[PDB]
RNA sequence: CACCAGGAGUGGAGCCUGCGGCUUAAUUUGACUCAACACGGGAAACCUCACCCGGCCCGGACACGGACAGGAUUGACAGAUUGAUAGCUCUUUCUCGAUUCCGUGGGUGGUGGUGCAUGGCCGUUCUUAGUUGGUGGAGCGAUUUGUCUGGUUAAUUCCGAUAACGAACGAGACUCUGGCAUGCUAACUAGUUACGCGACCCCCGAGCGGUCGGCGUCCCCCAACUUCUUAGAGGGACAAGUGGCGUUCAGCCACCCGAGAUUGAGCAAUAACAGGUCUGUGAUGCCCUUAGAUGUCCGGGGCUGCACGCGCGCUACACUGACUGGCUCAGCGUGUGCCUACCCUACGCCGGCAGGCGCGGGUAACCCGUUGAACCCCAUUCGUGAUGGGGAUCGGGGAUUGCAAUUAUUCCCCAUGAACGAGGAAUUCCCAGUAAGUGCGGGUCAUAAGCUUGCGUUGAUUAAGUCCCUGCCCUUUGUACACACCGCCCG
RNA sequence: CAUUGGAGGGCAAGUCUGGUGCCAGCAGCCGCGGUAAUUCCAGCUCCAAUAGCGUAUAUUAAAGUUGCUGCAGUUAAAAAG
């Protein structure tokens, strides 16, 4: 088993989103921007060069 | 099983059942007393009887309990629909069942009390039921650090040859302390001399005798009767 | 894991179906007996179970590659109202003392 | 578990195994005479692993306070990164979502420590016949009788001494196996089948005719039986008779009735050892590991490295060697998905065997297989020549399971051709289908036996006495010994 | 607010708990402490007198272990060779 001192990282990656990160931006009221895409074509987001969400691994390219 | 197959296997898995059950109900239902079970398989059946000194606990609450643990063993182990049952019996000669004997002194023992006036009174409930011979050993340190171990024994007790398993009803069991294990084994004859329930072959294993032996005896000389 | 969940609600509908229950030791064998076609080859009774029988709502028993569940009284109301059904404390059992 | 009357052997040699010895990333621990060493299905590349390098997973509960709406918190191609097509973890992002983590309390588990903490548990005292109370009795207590001259047996089983009597357990009893069964019991799922050479077959032969001989050749089955056949009960065998001895006590040698007792295998004590079992266990008390694991999945290596020692060991040292070819001759048992992955066989088509091919019998008196089993058999040979032997080493390939054989794990060949001449140091084993020779089964498996433990054959030397050597039990009987001669012990 | 000696038997009370680990201490006798300590150091609890308690050393009884009442001499230490 795990003789060795080092097991490297069993932590999960720390995410910064308790505090303040992109969402959606603002304006006056009855119209209203994207920050990163939440429409279905969660966060619709252009990762590098795909658009690709969390868990449900839902299913898009360039939108 | 859903393979069908050979008598060989199928014997063996029937055997594999029984084993498979024993253990599970002894440290299942062990709640009250405990005796035993007896299984045998028939045409488009299968019967199982368990015979312990608390037709309830075998029998269950509103018919709950025995309807609730019966269907999911039943499918688990891939089984038809209606076929295995499981049918309680009261041991009528209680006081000889050795295991039975053996698991209400487990209970009264984890409770914390004294093993020799507790044993005294295993010995007087057999022979109040009617026995030939028992002994009983008990082992772990009743004190400290240095090994212990006692020894109660009185009748006739044999040991070699084949009889002892179905004339004595042996019995083993453990306990768990918060110092530690104690093991107890009683060996107890079985009660009646006839072949009753837990009676064994008729004969004793003894010398000859008379029941109304013949002579003859009397004057009978010659004369005759004319019927 | 625990708190991601789509196969781990069945237990309590089983557990109401029938209150003794049967399983087995192996994550590493997708086995999974009687009745195993609903899509939870015997995984998720190791998760929150476990912290129910802490609560001592049922009973369990290690033996023979076969562990053992048996359902009590006092625990219906709870193992009900995670999903607000009707109070039935009926498995299946047609009132036979057999 | 001994001697005597003999042999199969070690030990010496080739080679595989475990025990120490050196080392090694550790070459894993256990055990250390007899009752440590083919032992723990321990025959391990990888899970199987407890070991030596590196990583996933927390299934660390829960309560309390923390963090919890910029949500506490759980995913995942990218460029990295590695031993790796680890979204491990960064660049980053994204949403089960109150069923997390951070400190306390829980240590889940566990092949972490102990068998000398203990249980269930085995070896083993010693395998023998030895272990208790009742009354009564001798003893002021301990104790003792009960349990014992002798005939007497595998027996503490009898008679029998009679302060003992009435009692058991251990032996006899409790079962299996093999053996007298020409009488019993019946199987179209077994065989038979003697009967209807009937139908096929050869004239096979003298004869080349009547018939005698050989068909595992069939009869479709609503013919038939268990001689043989697998075996239920019925039933043998008890010194039973008698020739001898005693006291004709319990019995012993022999022969007629023949199976003459007892063929071997089993079953399983009291006190206990501190011998072994916590690394068969969630059998199990302490404490220990408790997020950089001894829990967990995995990859490579290790449990198999060699200057020695030892045992358990297969193959022999060649002429009764033995080489090729023929045919002379079974029962052990497993035999298709399992508690989750691979069940017992056969036919022809190819390469030589290994090895490729697909059709098919079978959940088993159906089927392999009338296991058309070897070594006994014989023809054959060169010729007492490390010799065609005893036949490794290593070379060159071929297939074969497997994620993967590299330090040959296995199979097969060409071919490599070696150490060896019945072995001095100690010792075992058996005096009867028994040793030994010995092919075959069955446990391990993806691979599979020089091991286990059974089947089975061709079957030997002398032995029927004795405690002289090592060893149980008995009696007398000395003892500073009370862990009992491996003990105290003395200057 | 009143204590002095104990908390193993002998010898009158706890098969007391944390320790400490044959370590200090207790034990006039035995032994107790060699991690699962009834002898140590503390907490409760109980034992013994009590304004007392022992400590220590002379004195006595128990004593028939001075034998006068009223010893023993096989083995125990003992009778001249």
Known sequence: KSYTTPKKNKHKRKKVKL???????????????????????????????????????????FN | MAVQISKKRKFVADGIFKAELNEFLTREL?????????????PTRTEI???????????????????????????????????????????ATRGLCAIAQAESL????????????????????????????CEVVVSGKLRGQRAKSM??????????????NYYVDTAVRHVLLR????????????????SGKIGPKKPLPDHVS???????????????EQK | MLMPKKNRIAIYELLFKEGVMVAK????????????????????????????????????????RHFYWYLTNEGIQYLRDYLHLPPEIVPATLRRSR
């Not at chain 1, 969402?23 to 279905?40: A, F, H, M, T």
């Not at chain 2, 984890?110 to 057999?126: E, H, K, Q």
């Not at chain 2, 110092?179 to 006839?194: E, S």
């Not at chain 2, 008379?210 to 005759?224: F, N």
């Open chain 1, 19 to 61: 505090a303040v990160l992109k969402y959606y931006k603002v304006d006056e009221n009855g119209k209203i921007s994207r920050l990163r895409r939440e429409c279905p074509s969660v966060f619709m987001a252009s990762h590098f060069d795909r658009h690709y969400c969390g868990k449900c691994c839902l299913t898009y390219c």
């Open chain 2, 30 to 42: 062990a709640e009250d007393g405990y005796s035993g079970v007896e299984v045998r398989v028939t």
């Open chain 2, 49 to 91: 009887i368990i015979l312990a000194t608390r037709t309830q606990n075998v029998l269950g609450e509103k018919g709950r309990r025995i309807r609730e643990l019966t269907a999911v063993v039943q499918k688990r182990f891939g089984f038809p629909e209606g076929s295995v049952e499981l049918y309680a019996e009261k041991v």
């Open chain 2, 106 to 133: 487990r209970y009264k023992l984890l409770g914390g009390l004294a093993v020799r006036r507790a044993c005294y009174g295993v010995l007087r409930f057999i022979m109040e039921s009617g026995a030939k011979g």
């Open chain 2, 151 to 164: 020894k109660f024994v009185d009748g006739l007790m044999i040991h070699s040859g084949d009889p002892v």
């Open chain 2, 179 to 194: 110092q530690g294990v104690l093991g107890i084994k009683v060996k107890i004859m079985l009660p009646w001399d006839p």
């Open chain 2, 210 to 224: 008379i029941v109304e032996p013949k002579d003859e005896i009397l004057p009978t000389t010659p004369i005759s």
């Open chain 3, 25 to 64: 030791k192996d994550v590493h064998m997708p086995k999974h007996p009687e009745l195993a076609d609903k899509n939870v080859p015997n995984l998720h009774v190791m998760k929150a179970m476990q912290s129910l029988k802490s609560r001592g709502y049922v009973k369990e028993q290690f033996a023979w």
